[PDB]
Structure 1
Amino acid sequence: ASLKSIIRQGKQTRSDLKQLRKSGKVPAVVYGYGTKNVSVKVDEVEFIKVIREVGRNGVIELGVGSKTIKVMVADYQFDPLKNQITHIDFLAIN
């Protein structure tokens, strides 16, 4: 399991988030052990791919900038209409 990420720069307005979601991209955040909070973005279909393979409770090799961080998916918001994930939280696991 290996997901790659991109760092979101400061202060996305709501139109930016809307365009971002109109792609296959998902806003997310990473926080926890040995790390400071970083706002990132992730592709939706690849995330579904790796989650269908590692399971709901599994470890991911998320790549953030130059680092790579073992991480676990803490929570996620989901739109019941439109059937699409809309936000994910990532938790560094030490």
Structure 2
Amino acid sequence: VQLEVKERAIRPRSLRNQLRHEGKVPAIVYGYQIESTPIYFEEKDLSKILREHGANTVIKMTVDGKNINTLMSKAQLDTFTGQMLHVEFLSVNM
């Protein structure tokens, strides 16, 4: 119902090095009624859904309007980190 719904830029170039330090999760969405955007996230809002709601349950991205029903596809990190990278959302509708 509510998440970290933000937007990004086309090529935010190598500033992403600093995104590795001060704690942001860059994320990815592409689907049916909206083609493709990248969206910010933080790690303290989705692992709580992974524990509480589960690893493969429904996420409702909201643009203060109609629903966007995404699901996880892949999130594999670099090792010896314990922090999120490469979150590919993937929406399949109702």
**TM-score band, normalised by the shorter chain?**
0.7 to 0.9
Match of 1:59 in 2: 58
Q: Distance in 2 between matches of 1:66 and 1:85?
A: 28
- 1:2, distance to aligned residue in structure 2 (A): 4.1
Q: Distance in 2 between matches of 1:12 and 1:26?
A: 14
The answer to which structure has the higher strand fraction is 1
Q: Tell me, which stretches of 5 or more residues in structure 1 are unaligned?
A: none
Match of 1:73 in 2: 72
Describe the superposition over 1:23-60 as per-residue Cα deviations: whole angstroms up to 9, x where unpaired: 33111110122221101110111121122222111111
Describe the superposition over 1:36-86 as per-residue Cα deviations: whole angstroms up to 9, x where unpaired: 110111011112112222211111122358664111111112122121111
Q: Distance in 2 between matches of 1:65 and 1:22?
A: 31
Q: Distance in 2 between matches of 1:65 and 1:26?
A: 22
Partner secondary structure for residue 84 of structure 1: coil
Larger Rg computed on CA atoms: 2
Q: Quickly say closer, same or farther: Cα 1:60–1:20, change in 2 above 3 A.
A: same
Equivalent pair of 2:4/2:40 in contact (CA under 8 Å): no
TM-score calculated relative to the size of structure 2:
0.81
1:8 aligns with 2:8: yes
What is the Cα-based RMSD across aligned positions, in Å?
A: 2.1
Q: Quickly say closer, same or farther: Cα 1:75–1:51, change in 2 above 3 A.
A: same
Q: Distance in 1 between matches of 2:28 and 2:58?
A: 16
